[PDB]
Design a protein around this motif. Structure first.
Motif, mmCIF file in Angstrom:
data_model
loop_
_atom_site.group_PDB
_atom_site.id
_atom_site.type_symbol
_atom_site.label_atom_id
_atom_site.label_comp_id
_atom_site.label_asym_id
_atom_site.label_seq_id
_atom_site.Cartn_x
_atom_site.Cartn_y
_atom_site.Cartn_z
ATOM 1 N N UNK A 25 0.826 -1.201 0.000
ATOM 2 C CA UNK A 25 0.000 0.000 0.000
ATOM 3 C C UNK A 25 0.865 1.258 0.000
ATOM 4 N N UNK A 26 1.854 1.298 0.887
ATOM 5 C CA UNK A 26 2.734 2.458 0.969
ATOM 6 C C UNK A 26 3.732 2.462 -0.187
ATOM 7 N N UNK A 27 3.846 1.328 -0.872
ATOM 8 C CA UNK A 27 4.766 1.214 -2.000
ATOM 9 C C UNK A 27 4.445 2.260 -3.062
ATOM 10 N N UNK A 28 3.158 2.423 -3.357
ATOM 11 C CA UNK A 28 2.724 3.392 -4.361
ATOM 12 C C UNK A 28 1.953 4.539 -3.716
ATOM 13 N N UNK A 29 0.913 4.198 -2.963
ATOM 14 C CA UNK A 29 0.102 5.210 -2.295
ATOM 15 C C UNK A 29 0.962 6.048 -1.354
ATOM 16 N N UNK A 30 2.038 5.449 -0.853
ATOM 17 C CA UNK A 30 2.936 6.148 0.059
ATOM 18 C C UNK A 30 3.865 7.090 -0.701
ATOM 19 N N UNK A 41 9.320 9.274 3.522
ATOM 20 C CA UNK A 41 9.306 8.441 2.325
ATOM 21 C C UNK A 41 10.647 8.483 1.599
ATOM 22 N N UNK A 42 11.580 9.280 2.107
ATOM 23 C CA UNK A 42 12.887 9.388 1.471
ATOM 24 C C UNK A 42 13.735 8.161 1.785
ATOM 25 N N UNK A 43 13.314 7.387 2.784
ATOM 26 C CA UNK A 43 14.045 6.177 3.144
ATOM 27 C C UNK A 43 14.056 5.216 1.956
ATOM 28 N N UNK A 44 15.130 4.495 1.750
ATOM 29 C CA UNK A 44 15.212 3.538 0.608
ATOM 30 C C UNK A 44 13.849 2.892 0.324
ATOM 31 N N UNK A 48 14.718 -1.874 -1.112
ATOM 32 C CA UNK A 48 15.897 -2.126 -0.291
ATOM 33 C C UNK A 48 15.526 -2.326 1.184
ATOM 34 N N UNK A 49 14.415 -1.737 1.616
ATOM 35 C CA UNK A 49 14.009 -1.856 3.015
ATOM 36 C C UNK A 49 13.250 -3.163 3.279
ATOM 37 N N UNK A 153 6.703 9.928 13.442
ATOM 38 C CA UNK A 153 7.293 11.087 12.782
ATOM 39 C C UNK A 153 6.256 11.816 11.932
ATOM 40 N N UNK A 154 5.487 11.058 11.155
ATOM 41 C CA UNK A 154 4.465 11.652 10.297
ATOM 42 C C UNK A 154 3.490 12.491 11.116
#
Ligand SMILES: CC[C@@H](C)N(C)C(=O)c1cc2ccccc2c(-c2ccccc2Cl)n1
Length: 169
Positions: A25-30, A41-44, A48-49, A153-154
């Motif tokens: 879900x967060x892959x694209x929607x995120x 969202x700047x995290x790899x 990679x995560x 954080x968000x």
């Protein structure tokens, strides 16, 4: 007839379905949402995560092997932990069904769910019988703090440090 523990392997692959479809879900929607609100969202990318399960998987296989090697290989006694872990983790950690609530700050349900799912379930399941394995998993807390802190954080990002004036004149 795999040489490795068939149980631990498959059961460890189970979280791959909920973890894959879950974060999917967060892959694209995120990645997109990030364009609107401020997210880490700047995290790899999950590319990679997501390997989080790869590392924890290795340690898991090891721990599991030890647990069963203690009580005596995989038997009716090992079915209680391994199973209760697969079932409890399934219905409990099953956080991908919140896709509908993923559009709300509640999206944190993911971290909280998978965190307590594998953590809690493994505490009463594996650590209950074998304390040594719990040490092989210990380094998994970092991951728990990873996602957990992410959501935290968000929240504080869009809404934090509150306490100012109103209108006044
Ligand atoms: C938002 C960036 C995600 C994809 N990231 C880099 C992760 O490390 C990650 C991996 C996951 C794997 C399985 C399940 C969840 C995650 C979550 C995550 C953390 C908090 C809330 C929602 C999600 Cl999908 N985050």
């Amino acid at each position: 007839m795999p040489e490795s523990w068939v149980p631990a392997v498959g059961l460890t692959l189970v979280p791959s379905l909920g973890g894959f479809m879950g974060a999917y879900f967060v892959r694209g929607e995120g990645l997109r949402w990030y364009a609107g609100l401020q997210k880490p969202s700047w995290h790899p990318p999950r590319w990679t995560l997501a390997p989080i399960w790869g590392t924890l998987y290795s340690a898991m296989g090891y721990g599991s092997y030890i647990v069963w090697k203690e009580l005596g290989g995989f038997t009716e006694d090992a079915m209680v932990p391994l199973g209760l872990y697969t079932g409890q983790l399934a219905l409990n950690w099953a956080w991908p069904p919140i896709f509908f609530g993923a559009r709300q700050m509640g999206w944190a349900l993911a971290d909280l769910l998978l965190v307590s799912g594998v953590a809690t379930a493994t505490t009463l399941a594996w650590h209950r019988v074998s304390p040594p394995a719990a040490r092989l998993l210990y380094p998994y807390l970092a991951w728990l703090a990873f996602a957990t802190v992410l959501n935290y954080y968000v929240w504080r990002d869009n809404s934090g440090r509150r306490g100012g004036s109103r209108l006044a004149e």
